[PDB]
Amino acid sequence: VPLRDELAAIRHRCAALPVVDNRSAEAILG
Amino acid sequence: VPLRDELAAIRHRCAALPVVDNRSAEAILG
Amino acid sequence: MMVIDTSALVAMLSDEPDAERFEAAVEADHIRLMSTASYLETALVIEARFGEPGGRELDLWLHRAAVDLVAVHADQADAARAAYRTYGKGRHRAGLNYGDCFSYGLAKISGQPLLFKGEDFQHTDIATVALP
Amino acid sequence: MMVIDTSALVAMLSDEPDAERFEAAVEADHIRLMSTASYLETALVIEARFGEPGGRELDLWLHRAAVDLVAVHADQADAARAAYRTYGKGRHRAGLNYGDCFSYGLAKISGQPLLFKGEDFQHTDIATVALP
Ligand SMILES: [Mg+2]
Ligand SMILES: [Mg+2]
C-alpha cells in the first residue's frame, strides 16, 4: 500500500538484471 | 530579393564572426 | 510539485548508493514532473544497461509514481539556452550538459525544484528538492 | 514539408562545404519544422563557437526561414526510444545519438522528410530530403 515499497520492488527487480552494456555516457554521446 | 540570398547573407556574417571556443566537443561529450 | 532529472531515476533504477532517499522524496510530493526529453535519456541509458526488460521497469515505475511527462516547449529551450552560457560545462567547470538543459529548462519555467544526483546541478540558480 | 536537423543548420551557419546546396533545399519547401531540442543543440553549438552574437544569427535564420519550432511530445520521445535500439550509435557503428533522436522523433511522428548532414540518419526508417 505505500509507494516507496512499490518503487523499491521495481528497483530491486531492475537492478538485478544482467548488465548487457557496462559503459555509462557515450551510450548518451551528444 | 529571394530567400537563398538572405540565408547566404546570414551565413557569411555568422561564419565571419570571431571564434571564441573550438570545434564541437563542448555540448558536452555527453 | 517536483521535477525529476535522469541522474536520479537512473540511480534509483540501477540501485545506486542513495536510492531509498530519492524514493522517499518522490513519495513526499504528490505531483511529479519529468521532461519528455529526460524520459528519453533515461530510457536510452537503462535499455542500453539492462536491455529491454530494464525498459519495462521504467514504464512501471513511471506508471506507479503517476509521473506527468511535460513536453519541451520553446520557452524551456530558451531558458536552457541562456543557462548553458553561465552554468554549462567546459575545461574543468563541472556544470550542465545537453541532457541537463531539459531538466533545468522545465524546472525554471514550472518554478518547481529539481531532484537529481551529482555535481551538474549543485551550483545553479534553480531550487533543489532536499532529501530526507 | 521538411524537418531540419542540427547538423544542417550548423553547417549552414559555419559555412561548411555543402552549405549552399542546403539553402537551396530550404527554399524548395516552404513549410519547415524543427524540434525545440534540435534548436537548443544548435543554439548551444553556435553560441559556444561564435559567442552570443552567433546566436543572434541563429535567431535571424529561424525567423527569416519562418521555421516552426515544434515541442517534443511523449509520442515523439516513444518512437525515438524504440528506434534507437535498432539504429543507435553503439560500439563500432555509426547511427543516431541522443541529440539525433529529437529530429528523428519529430520526423517519424510528423511523417515528413528530414534534412541533415552526415552519416547518422542515412540507414533509417525515415525519409531524407533530396539535396539539389
Ligand atoms: Mg540530465
Ligand atoms: Mg541532431
CATH number reported for the structural domain that contains residue D104 in this entry: 3.40.50.1010
Range A7-13, long-range pairs (CB < 8 A, 24+ positions)? A7/C12, A7/C23, A7/C26, A7/C27, A7/C61, A7/C64, A7/C65, A8/C20, A8/C23, A10/C13, A10/C57, A10/C60, A10/C61, A10/C64, A11/C12, A11/C13, A11/C15, A11/C19, A11/C23, A12/C15, A13/C57
Grid coordinates given for B30: 555527453
Q: Which ligand is nearest to the CA of D89?
A: 2
This PDB structure is determined at a resolution in Å of 2.7
D122 touches chain A (CB under 8 A): no
Phi, psi (degrees; rounded to nearest 5) at C76: -70, -50
Which residues of D does the annotation place in the binding site for Mg(2+)? 5, 100
Edge-to-edge strand list for the sheet holding D114-115: D68-70, D32-35, D2-4, D114-115
The count of other CB atoms within 10 Å of the CB of residue A25 is: 14
Number of structural domains in chain C: 1
Q: How far apart are CA D120 and CA D83, in angstroms?
A: 13
Distance from CA of B24 to the nearest CA of A (A): 9
| CA D68 centroid distance within chain | 12
A26 touches chain C (CB under 8 A): no
Alpha helices per DSSP H over C1-132: 6-13, 19-28, 36-49, 51-64, 74-87, 98-110
Domain holding D97, by residue range, is 1-132
CA–CA distance, D86 with D75 (Å, rounded to integer): 18
* Residues of chain C found within 8 Å of residue B27, distances taken between Cβ atoms: 97-98
Q: How far is CA C23 from CA A17, C12, C61, C105, in A?
A: 20, 8, 11, 23
Method by which this entry was solved: X-ray
- Rounded-to-integer distance, Cα D33 and Cα D69, Å: 6
Distance in angstroms (rounded) separating the CA atoms of residues C31 and C28: 9
Q: Which residue has the cell 564541437?
A: B24
Angle between helices A3-15 and C6-13 (to 10 degrees): 70
Q: Residue A17: which of C20, C23, C53 has the nearest Cβ?
A: C53
User: What strands lie across the sheet with C68-70, from one edge to the other?
Assistant: C68-70, C32-35, C2-4, C114-115
